[PDB]
Write a protein that binds this ligand. Sequence first.
Ligand SMILES: [Zn+2]
Ligand SMILES: [Zn+2]
Length: 81
Amino acid sequence: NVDVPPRDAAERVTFATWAIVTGKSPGGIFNELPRLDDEAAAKIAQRLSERAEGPITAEDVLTSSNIEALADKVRTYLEAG
Ligand SMILES: [Zn+2]
Ligand SMILES: [Zn+2]
């Protein structure tokens, strides 16, 4: 199995935001994500909300299995902008 890098704007910003806040890259868009504390989840959510210009919550971040899933939420906002 091989890591899949981010494919579009939504995946790149989501992947990068996760890595920046936690200090560790998710590896790829399908990799299982490590568990976060609520502060890291809130920061990721705030940053994604600002960039996507739509509401992304700490719960959205916490319930995402991988970056692809979280980026899907971000993508819905980018295409509606
Ligand atoms: Zn890897
Ligand atoms: Zn998808």
